[PDB]
RNA sequence: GGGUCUCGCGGAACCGGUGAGUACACCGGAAUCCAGGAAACUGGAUUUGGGCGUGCCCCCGCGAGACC
């Protein structure tokens, strides 16, 4: 008996004094309750705009919102700063709610190429029978960004996962780690172990390599 | 003034129970309808559960059905989320927040409270592993060095990360844990600094995690011979 | 008597719309009767309590009862 809300974009980039745009299409219902919420990390979502187009009382009116038949749009006509945020639009009817996916609005700046660098495990950690190498990238800018590790020249699959922190408050930068983790018996097998990145900053992709047990 | 407040949030294994309560104060809820609405760790907003208090009339996500029952006691001004068959899929913080009017409307939901963390997980509480990521033996990129901790192999989140006991931050990187397959998190916290000062300055990472007691200090040096 | 409760009997059919937020206010098709016309139609009179999860609920009138 759910309702649905398809948002988009996921993510959008820009700048202070932008307008910016955000939309939801709502799927089963034709419901008007249609709500836009802004929430920032840690913290509870706020509402902004109710009923697709009333603004909330509090929010500063570059907040507005329309609808053109299945279609609910945000505006913000001129970002400010403290409007970096998540955007969350929201349809109810007499029973079900429901809310769209999400659109993260980010600080655009200028292309940034990573710093990347490399770690072995270190000799404690394989006492336990565990080895994690990990590749950092260092304050880069768009946040797309391909990481790819050979072992003995051999493409891994499977066995890496990788976090990525927050837009730099500073510098609007972002960086990452990639780990990845192998069993004792298998890392001490191999020789050669890379990380090989792919990003907009780069004219060919970046390669750090170690070998195990070298200098 | 107007106040929400979620409580009874917690750890419980798979198939185990918990309840929710969410009390308001400096209105009544018999005025409004009460919404709960969850967030899983990284992802977006999903409706949980709607009541009119007035009427008790009840509406539930798909995704809860027969496992989640929501009720409101005018009395106490509360509403609470009984939460029976719980999953791995159902940790998240769960908000509560009110809707003007006593039956349907077009208001949004104008008040959240902060929400009540609720972990669903058969792992054991364990503190953290950790290992150095020795700085490289060349000049990394632009005369500077990388180097930090590998806090590995701990339940439940929170760990807590500094450098040189706070003396430290500029250049810091702490990312955010991953949940591994194993059912325990893992997470690094990486610095640049100076390539001139690896002989002279030392760096120690200091990870505390409060659900197991465990605090650890850990100097990070070059890999030598 | 007045409050809560409970039970019984009543409160034209169908479709759609506006504004609410409860279970209300309103509007258009429509229906029944009369008259006119060969017909398409036209004029006059009269007319249904509501909510949404559509099978359950709220409300109104009448009757019976229980408890303060």
């Known amino acids: 008996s759910d309702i649905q809300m398809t948002q988009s974009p996921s993510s959008l980039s820009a700048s202070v004094g932008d307008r910016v745009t955000i939309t939801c299409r709502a799927s089963?219902?034709?419901?008007?309750?249609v709500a836009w919420y802004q929430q920032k990390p840690g913290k509870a979502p706020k509402l902004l705009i109710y009923?697709?187009?009333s603004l909330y009382s509090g929010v500063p009116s570059r907040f507005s919102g329309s609808r053109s038949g299945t279609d609910f749009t945000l505006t913000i006509s001129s970002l400010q700063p403290e409007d970096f945020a998540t955007y969350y639009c929201?349809?109810?009817?007499?029973?079900?709610?429901?809310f769209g996916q999400g659109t993260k609005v980010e600080i655009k700046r200028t292309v940034a190429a990573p710093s990347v660098f490399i770690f072995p495990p270190s000799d404690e950690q394989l006492k336990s029978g565990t080895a994690s190498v990990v590749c950092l990238l260092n304050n880069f800018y768009p946040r797309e960004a391909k990481v790819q590790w050979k072992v003995d020249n051999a493409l891994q699959s499977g066995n890496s996962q990788e976090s990525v922190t927050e837009q730099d408050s500073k510098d609007s930068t972002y960086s990452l780690s990639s780990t990845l983790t192998l069993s004792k018996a298998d890392y001490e097998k191999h020789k050669v172990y890379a990380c090989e990145v792919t990003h907009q900053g780069l004219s060919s992709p970046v390669t750090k390599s170690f070998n195990r047990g070298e200098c | 003034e107007v106040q929400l407040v979620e409580s009874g949030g917690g750890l419980v294994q798979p198939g185990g129970s918990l309840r929710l309560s969410c009390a308001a104060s400096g209105f009544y809820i018999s005025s409004y309808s009460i919404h709960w609405v969850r967030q899983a760790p990284g992802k977006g907003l999903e409706w949980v559960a709607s009541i009119y208090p007035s009427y008790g009339y009840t509406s539930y996500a798909d995704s809860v059905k027969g496992r989640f029952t929501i009720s409101a006691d005018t009395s106490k001004n509360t509403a609470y989320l009984q939460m029976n068959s719980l999953r791995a899929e159902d940790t998240a913080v769960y908000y509560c927040a009110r809707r003007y009017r006593s039956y349907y409307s077009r208001y949004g939901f104008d008040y959240w409270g902060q929400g009540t963390l609720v972990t669903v997980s058969s792992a054991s509480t364990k503190g953290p592993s950790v290992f150095p990521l020795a700085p490289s033996s060349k000049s990394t990129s632009g005369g500077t060095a990388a180097l930090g901790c590998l806090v590995k192999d701990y339940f439940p989140e929170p760990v807590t990360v500094s450098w040189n006991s706070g003396a430290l931050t500029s250049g810091v990187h702490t990312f955010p844990a991953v949940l591994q397959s194993s059912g325990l998190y893992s997470l690094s916290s990486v610095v640049t600094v100076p390539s001139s000062s690896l002989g002279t300055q030392t760096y120690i990472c200091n990870v505390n995690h409060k659900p197991s007691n465990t605090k650890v200090d850990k100097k990070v040096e070059p890999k030598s011979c």
């Open positions: 009923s697709a187009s």
């Open positions: 089963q219902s034709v419901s008007s309750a």
């Open positions: 929201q349809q109810s009817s007499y029973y079900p709610s429901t």
